[PDB]
Symmetry: D2
Subunit: 386 residues, 4 copies
């Protein structure tokens, strides 16, 4: 019955199940959770691990002794449960000092502080076993046009990521970075607003091999984009280092619904792609149990994230394995799509009369793609209506 186990690599941020329910118009509806209790409850649900921002694990402004004790208790919870910490990140968005950004703040002293804060937490992430270090620059951007020269900001962003790369290399760390795009919220427009923009930016870094993307379902959907398509481009680039899974109902504030909620068919095609491509990273949920829920509803919502992934995995696998679907894929020429256009080379193509002079465009145009039959087979598989 779609029961998750640690082998499924499901992970959750401390800040997900720990979200107290404050929104722009509302006070908290739930008490803060001790990270130790979240680690235990998530393990009981079949999670593999957790993730953290610095300030989720150690309250901002903690003394060294307080820091040591927070980490010691967390380590004990990991040891008590067998949970892992595959990813960590920095909070460069909550404190009012970051109101115009961390790495791209107009104030240079803030940019330097943001880097120091990040570096401190990279060390801790490595200590706790993380393989990936996420950077979500939620405050990088603007509400107005004069406030932020974007070329200058990208220069500062590159400078910051290059320094972080220099740092991890200098320490001999194996950890890699994953840049998380988002189009807007909390800034009017956020820099690196989509998977594409982040992929493009990485190519200008000094050591691009150290950086990939951490796409989030709802973020791409906040720009009305196709999340599976963006994931495909990230995979094509060799840059899908981590992923954030959740749900979103279209173009609006980021909802962070449990995975499977929001756009259900996009969730199906996403799981199909991740599984077909052999993505081996964490299946990480960056979601918020709605603030309508109590403590029991938090765990139900977390359980639902994993359940929905597993149902979709089953249905996508059944779709791909069905001989009738395999026939439909051939009827729609998906096999042809995967063959080179012109392995014969440019001159051969130029000399090939079947490619122009004697190409029967009308006969080709008349051939239906048979995509609707294929898609209804996909629908039938998703719904268990075969």
């Amino acid at each position: 019955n779609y029961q998750p186990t640690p082998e499924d690599r499901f992970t959750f941020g401390l800040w997900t199940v720990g979200w107290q329910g404050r929104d722009p118009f509302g006070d908290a509806t739930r008490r803060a959770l001790d990270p130790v209790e979240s680690v235990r409850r998530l393990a009981e649900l079949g999670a593999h691990g957790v993730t953290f921002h610095d300030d989720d694990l150690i309250p901002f402004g903690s003394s060294d002794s307080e820091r040591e004790e927070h980490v010691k208790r967390f380590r004990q919870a990991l040891d008590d449960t067998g949970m892992k910490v595959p990813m960590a990140t920095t909070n460069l968005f909550t404190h009012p000092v970051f109101k115009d950004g961390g790495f791209t703040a107009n104030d240079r002293d803030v940019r330097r502080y943001a880097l120091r804060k990040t570096i401190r937490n990279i060390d801790l992430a490595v200590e706790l076993g993380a393989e990936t270090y996420v950077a979500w620059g939620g405050r990088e951007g603007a509400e107005s046009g004069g406030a932020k020269d974007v070329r200058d900001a990208l220069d500062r962003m590159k400078e910051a990521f290059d320094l972080l790369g220099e740092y991890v290399t200098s320490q001999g760390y194996d950890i890699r970075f994953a840049i998380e795009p988002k189009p807007n919220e909390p800034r009017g427009d956020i820099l690196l607003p989509t998977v594409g923009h982040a992929l493009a930016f990485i190519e200008r870094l000094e050591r691009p091999e150290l950086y990939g993307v951490n796409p989030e379902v709802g973020h791409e959907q906040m720009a009305g984009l196709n999340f599976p398509h963006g994931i495909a481009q990230a995979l094509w680039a060799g840059k899908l280092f981590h992923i954030d899974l959740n749900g979103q109902n279209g173009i609006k504030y980021d909802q962070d619904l449990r995975f499977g909620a929001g756009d259900l068919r996009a969730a199906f095609w996403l799981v199909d792609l991740l599984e077909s491509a052999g993505y081996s990273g964490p299946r990480h949920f960056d979601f918020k149990p709605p603030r309508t829920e109590d403590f029991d509803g938090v765990w139900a919502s977390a359980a639902g994230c994993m359940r929905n992934y597993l149902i979709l995995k089953e249905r996508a696998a059944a779709f791909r394995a069905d001989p009738e679907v395999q026939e439909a894929l051939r009827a729609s020429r998906l096999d042809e799509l995967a063959r080179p256009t012109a392995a014969d080379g440019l001159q051969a193509l130029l000399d090939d009369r079947s490619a122009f002079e004697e190409f029967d465009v009308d006969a080709a145009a008349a051939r239906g793609m048979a995509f609707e039959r294929l898609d209804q087979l996909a629908m039938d598989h998703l719904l268990g209506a075969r």
Copy 2:
């Protein structure tokens, strides 16, 4: 009075002023224009040049003799007016053969045909003096998830662009390519949906230096993105080879309103950026006079494109030159944004107690950014209310 002259480099597609007004629910409202008459009328308005798809200039399926005559008449119109042709492109979207794409059609024979059709028109573009060859893959994409394996499609897309690069190099042509992203329409989702995705893709081509982007105002706005920000990232990458200017009112079908219509403040910030950055390419309008208009309204709408650019240019220049604005920019630390974060280097940053151990985060947080005063100065300049 904001009168354009050829020195302003304003250009228009034949298909813009020549749009007959067919939309998904409506028949044509205007007769087809002879390209010769468009060249003359645009010249009279102060345009610098025009652009074309193959099939705008030579009707699809024309004989060699018909082709020669269409080109001869067009050349005479250019010679009669002094108009230039700085850019051309291929129509890989109208004919039903392209219903699943050109370069990424599932049918291999269609992909080969698309390449041959493109190559033929590259030769003509070069003959007519074009410096840039645009590719808008409007049919590349899908309505359903099973129809298009996006990694395979990107492999085919790369194969196509690499072959085109091989071709231009083999002929010793100086022409460069500009890939035009669009998020959707006419496909449910289009591949390379934003400037970022196109920039990222280019980095995987064999000869990336031959390819840039041709962003269109309304296309990025169809994903709710900030067009000036995307242009800034393209400029930062050295990839703004051409641009398509128009207007769009938010997230909906692509409207192709005249430039300045739609998001007026985004048009202001765009012009500010293009002028500040010294963009030297064509100011090309890819727009449609609304189908409500007659022949006189077509030319009024085209004239308005250029007028609005020139008004915005004046106001943006006045904004940047105003000593009160220059003071406000310093008050908002735009000067600091342009200074390196850590030219002192990583070790110096790590050793700098002013960056962490002794950084007064509260004092920094308390410093207002003064962005609202800056933005109201920008508003006052735009509106001529200083």
Copy 3:
């Protein structure tokens, strides 16, 4: 196996399966269908009936003799199959005369013509047995602010609908009107853009009882609205006279995908509502088989519309009948939602200390809504994962 029969009341517009595939960037990909062949093929799939615009059934500009023959052949097809015509409508959008509207065209002569064209087709609709006459004012609206004074346009719109009401009353017809909102496309903004705006407008008509709404799934979703919620408000008002079923992937051009495609969970909640509320009107599909498809794909896509409705009907009924769901609904206080707030009356409420002076707000706030467990039961039912 989810096989439709005429008893399910599934209907289709002639223009749906008959869509030739022209889009703003593309020529037709399919030949025109004879309405007679559509009636036969739809009947073979288990449809109950069809619908038409005037100009779908009788080519625009037909002579009286041509008109009679088109109608005679159509009547014979209905008689040969047992198909019904429960709804008809007017094409007030294709012909260039309607470029600024029908009923709200700025030109008064066009407004008068639009009314005459509509009245002629009301007579034919009644002859063919229609119970509902739809009006989709797709050209009513504007691209620019000065072009259309909306108060004046609403005065003209009211005048038109009042005249149509006067007409049907004068003829003793039983037919009722259903106004179809759409937010945009083909106009930049369309008047009466949502279900709410149309419902509000109807209340100002002289005989509001003669008018309801014909909401379309994708239209409300083009404004990012919740289609089931809008349908609920229409039902609450007693105004759901007809419905148009299709699919849409978010905020973009209207896609007109087959029903069940697009937002699958919204389709589930829609069917749940229509069935729970006992909606007894046609289940009408206003969709377009994608232009990728041939003749066989058209019929597959049409069949899929009906199949998906029937699957969703089964799953929604199972959800509502499941004792575990019934318990979850009580746990979430859906029963309380359906009880009056203050049947005791205003003075009793004012005098009730349990409602304010002695209301334990903290205890009430602490009660979780249990919505996530409820929603995961709904997901499990939809996916056949109980």
Copy 4:
């Protein structure tokens, strides 16, 4: 120089300039303001008045003595400045008790409490001189489909508004209600999501004359709708009782930018309409100075709201008064739009051969609307480029 005075009727919510800057990802960036200091500073800027939620003026949970003192100090500030309080409202969204709604909470005890809380504040609003009582049901709605039966919720909503109407009538108050639609945020979907839905709902209330709408610029724009068009429909219905002015950049979280920011041309057309129609209510700003700003930036942003209104008022008036624009309006047949379609009556229309049998559709279709010239005159007026 566009200097506001109290005669312009500009008003501001206490919660606007008083916004501390908490957003979903960020802590406060500004200290709380004493309402007394806001009243004084706003008066100094030329405001006419302020507005409040109950809990802005009197901290939630205040004792009777504390309440009296808060009100006494506020009254003194009004008296010291000459400021008015034309509108007040209830906070039915911040406290966790309202997590599933106030008037449409599933819990009946919460619905009763919401009504009592509202009634208490209606009394205070009347004492302080308010003419309008706003209701923004920001928590009314759902994240998931099973959580909220919308027909039942609308029954509860009607019951609540009817009770409030009964209450004000019983007390002999002159105050009227204004329902504020919003499409989403903080709920996934909010009930009464647009002006149209709210107008439609009002028509089902027992005493509809007591209720109008309070539309907010950014709210309609969050559904991609045309705010001026919605205002026109509200005016057409006689229901524009109050308005909330701000800015919004498209479809995303509600930004609450200062008025004039966001969609500048929509702001122009809005002011044109309000002034042309003779709207006499408050010009109320419901905005948030961005959290980047300090105390000085708050007042600059507030001043900008009023300045932008006044600039736009000047330009719209100049547009309408320009004889060249008046000629263009006639050329575009705006005069015809304002004339009845068929004051001659239905039978005369049916008998009028010029309306059908002898209507030259082709000649009518050929007449351009001249909307682009009109719109460029509007652009030139807005930009001071005539």
